[model samples]
Target: PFVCANEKDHLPPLDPQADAWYREAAALAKPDTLRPWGRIVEIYSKAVERGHWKAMHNLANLYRTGWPGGVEKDPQKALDLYQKMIDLDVPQGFYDMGAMIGNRAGVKNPATDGLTFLDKAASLGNPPALTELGKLYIYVAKEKELGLAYASCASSQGYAPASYELGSYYELVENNYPKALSYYQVSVSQGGRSAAFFLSRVFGKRTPPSSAMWYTPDEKLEKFYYSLYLQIDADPDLRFPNLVKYNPLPPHPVQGYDAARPDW
Candidate 1:
């Protein structure tokens, strides 16, 4: 049974105190700061007590990776946090649980290594998990249709990376330029920065142009896409869903720009 719903509905309302703690901890954890890992860990640990799922995830990551001046390497702690998330019905928790178990996060089990958890996550319609499963089955497991279905499901949920996946699959693998460009444009509209890079490369001479590609080389279009990529990369949280229509690219030469066909 396939379902398409907004992934935001999965998260619970965040506690204000917990949100404050998480924000502070995240700010300190950034590279620009002194990176006081110990302080960061303590704050996140406090936030975790306040039922902050984000703080829980961050704390588990710290435990999993073991910061230099913070928590020691402890997969058990990470596993416990993930289990807590599963109890809370957090889709990301299932994805993380599957990743930990599948990768043998300091545990060995002959029966299952986490694919079941991943399957559960996909069934719940988690876009990130769906995208990952799509990649796994598509490339590694060699299940084209199944992987495509998974990718399509994630894309239908409007996941930026999933859109890029289909675009890349069509462009590089199937050589379907029109389909590829269409998906890529959708990806870019959804703030998929990587898609913008590929669009720029496709229209410009950055990479060897494919004869089968849908569009010809266009200096103006290349600049526009590259600019879009730069703007998004600078601040990833920005979305440009209606950028083409609202703030369309100006004429290239400004002197005598023609809208004639450019040999697609």
Candidate 2:
């Protein structure tokens, strides 16, 4: 029985050398390459030796699902690395531990053991952990209200995907278009391209005029969001903090848009 401590305030900074090794390993493991797992493992091992949390996480995964030639599948080794991460008070460690336990890593009780670590992770404000708990609470526990609360908490912390989740929940499950629209609006600002797509669709010309809802079809809003969506989909990581102030929609092609494709 291990005691969990809260160390959110002073998390360890990344070690640059270790980070370099991790980056090298990641580039080597890219899909286009042959994926020489042996070399990848060697580099990740060096990074892990320097107490790199990121490297520890990746190395643990490598052990969890061993590659063909390099690492042998060893859940115990993965658990050990996760334990080391917890020893350093990394919140992701707790989340990974919970995930491993839940995935049948030979824990004492898979049913409830993992959730305990997940709770600790959420308490530390780990975004992915919060999202996981939000989903579990919504679907598995059948606590929709509590799940929404958790999701809102994650979104409030600026976790973009959580905002999208809340928007989807509001739109699909609750069918509260007004609330969903509000959440989706916030989501697009947080780099959620999918939310922009949904907003574009909602404001586009497809909706019936007689449909009683909070929002109405607007050609201008639709065009703006569609442009925004195209830009974001082209680069998922791109963000426009001052979206409305800086990135005005270009003129319609029929109006005055340059056929030569001038940058907007």
Candidate 3:
């Protein structure tokens, strides 16, 4: 059933006035496979120019991370854009900007200020920010209650990373194996990479005399996890046109297959 074809010519022209419609259309039209290019860039740029807060945040992400043919990974520019978005009360901007500061990725060490930003983001109900705050509480401050609260909040929002974190805590800290397994399963089902890796390990630890075979089941799960990775790698929308001139993987593979495999 697998066939390869160059489908760019078959794609519909972008709508200039309908930003949300374009995004939805793009998402439906094999988002992972769509190369970020002329019309897409123009749309994002126009949205930012028109002061669409969320669009500004997204466009800034493109530039900050050098996605879709963006010229450079300019953290300063990203920070500026994030700040503007924050001023406009865009929730995700607070989360992303807090993350940058917390990890000191682009800015200098502003430890206290970074935490403050994270708190601000979390208070505003940004799930990723809540997860980050939970991590800070668990690792840096050693506050279990605070960590658990924030982690639970983020997990409730369907954030895979947060689910994975809570899973880890349940397994390692509370010794709640069943709950841990449930959380890990949810995280992996939702595309959490770390959860997949850890789930493979957890499955390996299953007792003997059980129906499961350690190496065989582990291998199967590993393959499944990596298959998801391939899906992400082959997605067209992820291929930043300005960033890379060539398609990272031609002919996107179906779910559960490795698109990166040469023979595929």
TM-score of each: 0.74, 0.64, 0.61
After superposition, candidate 2 runs with Cα above 4 Å error:
1-10, 27-38, 65-74, 103-115, 139-145, 185-240, 243-264
lDDT tens digits, residues 157-213, model 3? Answer: 667788899877865676555556567656655566666566555434353512121
lDDT of each: 0.74, 0.72, 0.57
Give the better candidate number (1 or 2) by lDDT: 1
The parts of candidate 1 lying over 4 Å away from their true place are 27-36, 66-74, 103-115, 140-145, 211-214, 244-264
- Predicted candidate 2 versus true structure: per-residue lDDT over 1-264, tens digit per residue: 222233355366779999999988876775544678888888998998999988899889999898877678989989899988877767788779878875334234332344467776676777677877788889899988788777877787667788888877865676655556666767787778888887787767776532313345678888888787887776565676676356443343222222233232
| Model 3 weakest lDDT span, ten residues long | 247-256
lDDT for 86 in candidate 1 is 73
Q: What order do candidates take by lDDT, descending?
A: 1, 2, 3
Candidate 1 has a TM-score of: 0.74
On TM-score, the leading prediction is 1
User: In model 1, how large is the Cα lDDT of residue 180?
Assistant: 70
